[PDB]
């Protein structure tokens, strides 16, 4: 299309939430999503969890899964019939939402409210949302290695990554995961379950002393590492990769402490790099501390440009400047951007929550500023709650195997109350 | 009496506010603009307070507040240009009203409302924060007694010019603490006045020379000699340790062995941005440069802009900055007013600053001017200083070269990597490289 009122750059979780937010407040809105991926907007969490614990051997083709409730759903937010074609977008009665897949915005002209695509096309907009997300980081050791090593290394984020790694797990006998965060630990439990049926091997190495060493306190991180080992995973904590090479066709990971790991494939889950390529041509400011596009409390960068999702470094009126990489955050920030793109002028207020499932026995939700560096107070009874403190106020909460009580945690963070006894606060989560 | 509602609300009654009011009115001929000023005076420009008003021939200059540039007043406009705040929502085609002697003490961004120090509440449709900044003080003078604090002057407002002018006619020794442009301008002003009364003027600062933070050492040293020849006792490399009163006179004890006895002290040691309203308003402050953090359009939130000294903004060409120049307050205020009327345009036109150290020394500058940056100077009495970063000119200082600032502005905008800066110097009519 030559011109479109609402232009959403990127076809991920934040863009879809913004589109349906715009449509809700402007029933006749014409919204164009431009996505470099060939897929329609879809959610990613199932790519490292539900899709691996499915009984259907065609799950790689159907891309459907059963939720905690039990109802089956697809990873796509909506079926193709819910969208309109970009050709019909500036004609169809009552407008709609179109997705232009396989196209990447490569130049942003803020002055003329115009974007240029990788095929030379130019599109003008009235209001634009940057929801480009981010790219998985790689390891310098794997970068210094040859093509043989890189060709046997997976960066997990997209649907293709799930289908390729699922295919690898059925072809090799040993897969090593590098990274102790949520993604690395979830893929370990997933491959561990998948490995128990074929008798294969799953290794996980990371620099910390336990899984989520940057997020959970030491004692809980250590307890988690044992739960992951119970899933059939060989966990190698305190491991820093010095170099990676190929010897006799097998991958050989040399660690800084002298240890060596022989494996067939490597999955690198070592953080995310925000896609801020369009800031150069667009003259958009990026945040040197947190990375990403720097935006205000309303997720706004310029008069008619907002940013949401993983790529948005925003100002939290309550918690300070932040950048968050959570699914619910992309939904909340995307939804908020769409509202502000229709005159709402609302600041980021409703905090988002993140969750993670390390097998069917372990599952944690969380909200706010969750960092192992901050002081923590853990109350337990298999079940517990972790409070994250700063200036004598609770700024982050982790709920360990406690569900359907996130609104309670959200209220504690908002009230900013100075609690004399957190043990009493733990009763709000049914801990006694 | 302030109206309960006003379309445009400008907080602060300084240079940035006035420029925004003119801008708003030029784009919305019926705009109703309310300025709220904690000062009792109408908006006025400050550069004359340290320069032209001291070199005036009129002995009534302290009363008239007029100077020759053509003669004009320090006020941007006479009271006739303004309407009253009470009649602002009734006058046909609106106008600009100034509510003096009132301070905004609370900012509710959610409800687009402010609260004044008297309890008055004013809602707005669009708002500009133009609060400027407060002069800093020295910890040594903060630890001193009331006698010292009573004999210390923080120079910024009209009252400071009138109080210091009367003191220069009553005491024998005035010491200026601060080697920046303000301290140097006041030294040349008091030195010119002291040569006629037989008094003394002292200027001390920690740097090796005047404007040591701005100009290269060789140019800062040359400037210190001209200030000295204006009849000033300049004391470089001076760090104050304590200040006290002895035998009715002020005694300044420096970190080294030197001691200075004087009658009055003038501190020109920088500015502190007035960001008090950021707490209640939930507005972000910049921890590096200070001030309110705003984007390239000077916007903080949907209906709140910030201009002037208090605005930490994003320069698409030069990076995040905060500038404390008169022309910047004009340019950034005019830009804010345009954006408050839908312009949606970024800070693009670079502001210039200038300084006159007597009638024989005149500096003009533009861009990122910092002595820490690598510099290249080309001279012929006159010269140009190029401030470099990434092999590109990011700042220019023009030494006794006038009516060529648009040329300097183009060099910085073009971002060209010049193979020879002597050829670039010829654009300023320079034909000694340092
Ligand atoms: C495997 C996996 C599991 C996860 N599990 C969880 C979980 O359990 N809980 C949780 O809270 N979070 C989870 N997350 C994080 C959550 O998925 C992310 O926060 C969320 O996907 C971010 O959405 P987004 O809109 O910000 O960006 P993205 O989802 O990254 O979407 C951006 C899209 O824009 C495209 N794009 C980028 N640049 C351009 C351009 N110039 N032009 C056009 N298109 C462009 C990108 O290709 C991508 O398609 C998981 C993430 C992954 C990868
Ligand atoms: C003596 C002097 C000489 C100078 N000479 C030069 C020069 O030669 N060249 C040059 O380039 N620059 C010069 N400057 C710098 C230039 O004057 C400043 O950059 C300019 O005045 C900045 O304007 P502003 O509108 O941002 O703020 P200000 O001029 O400080 O105006 C802010 C006003 O808002 C008021 N205010 C603050 N908070 C509130 C509140 N909550 N409610 C109501 N009112 C409030 C303050 O009292 C003040 O009256 C000089 C400055 C001084 C002090
Ligand atoms: N369970 C998760 C919680 C938060 N963030 C995540 C990011 C990734 Cl990439 C994968 C899983 C996550
Ligand atoms: N001549 C000046 C140039 C730039 N900035 C100045 C700031 C002050 Cl406070 C006083 C004079 C100045």
Numbering used by the authors:
A (entry chain A): 129 to 509, 561 to 611
B (entry chain B): 127 to 195, 199 to 509, 561 to 611, 615 to 617
Sentences from the paper on this structure:
A 60-kDa FAD-dependent oxidoreductase, AIF allosterically switches between two distinct redox states. NADH binding by the oxidized AIF monomer reduces its FAD cofactor at a centralized active site, allosterically disrupting hydrogen bond networks to release a 50-residue surface loop (C-loop) and stimulate dimerization at the AIF surface. Oxidized NAD+ and reduced FADH– form a long-lived charge-transfer complex (CTC), which stabilizes and maintains the reduced dimeric state of AIF. NADH-activated AIF dimers support import of OXPHOS subunits by CHCHD4 and are critical for mitochondrial function.
To understand how SAXS CX1 and CX2 chemotypes engage AIF and enable dimerization, we crystallized select fragment hits with the W196A dimer-permissive mutant and wild-type AIF. Crystal structures of the W196A mutant bound to CX1 fragments and the underlying 4-aminoquinoline (4AQ) scaffold revealed that these scaffolds localize to the NADH active site, mirroring the native NADH ligand, as do CX1 and CX2 scaffolds bound to the wild-type protein. In all four W196A structures, the CX1 quinoline core aromatically pairs with the AIF FAD cofactor, positioning the primary amine to hydrogen bond with the E314 side-chain carboxylate and the W483 backbone carbonyl. To accommodate this amine interaction, the aromatic side chain of F482 must rotate out of the binding site. In AIF structures with NADH and CX1 fragments, the released H454 imidazole ring is well positioned to aromatically contact and retain the displaced phenylalanine ring of F482, thus allowing access to W483 and E314 contact sites. Halogen substitutions at positions 7 and 8 (fragments C12, D1 and D3) optimally accelerate dimerization. By contrast, the complementary chlorine-substituted analogs D3 and D1 with slower kVR rates do not make analogous halogen-π contacts, presumably from steric restriction of the larger chlorine atom. They still form optimal amine hydrogen bonds with the active site, and the aromatic edge at positions 2 and 3 is aligned to form edge contacts with F482 and H454 aromatic rings. When the AIF(W196A) mutant is co-incubated with CX1 fragments, the oxidized mutant fully dimerizes and remains dimeric throughout the time series, similar to the wild-type AIF–NADH–DMSO control. The ability of the CX1 chemotype to shift the dimer-permissive W196A mutant toward the dimeric state also implicates F482 displacement and H454–F482 pairing in allosterically stabilizing the AIF dimer.
